[PDB]
Amino acid sequence: SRVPNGLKTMCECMSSYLREQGKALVSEEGEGKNPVDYIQGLLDLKSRFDRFLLESFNNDRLFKQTIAGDFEYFLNL
Numbered sequence: 001s002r003v004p005n006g007l008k009t010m011c012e013c014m015s016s017y018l019r020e021q022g023k024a025l026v027s028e029e030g031e032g033k034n035p036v037d038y039i040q041g042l043l044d045l046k047s048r049f050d051r052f053l054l055e056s057f058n059n060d061r062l063f064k065q066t067i068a069g070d071f072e073y074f075l076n077l
Contacts, residue, residue, distance in 0.1 A: 007060065007062050007063075008062075011062050011063055011065075011066040012066075014063065014066060014067075015066045015067075015069070015070045018049075018066075018067060018070040018071075018074070019070060019073075019074060021045060022042075022070070022071075022074035022075075022077075023074065023077075025038065025041055025042055025045075026038070026074065026075070026077065046071075049067055053067075
């Protein structure tokens with residue numbers, strides 16, 4: 001947080017990991033993917049990331065913005 005352009009690439013890598021996890025969670029390949037179990041897994045990740053934000057990123061606006069955009073794009077995919 002002391003050096004400029006640090007939170008930028010931090011949130012960039014966080015969003016990259018979020019995209020990877022999402023593409024792994026909504027992977028079209030596979031028929032019969034329990035619809036309920038799918039969202040349950042995403043719910044666990046979502047709550048864990050919200051807890052991570054308040055327990056580590058001290059509720060920084062940038063991190064919130066990034067995770068929001070990420071979720072939107074991947075679920076729209």
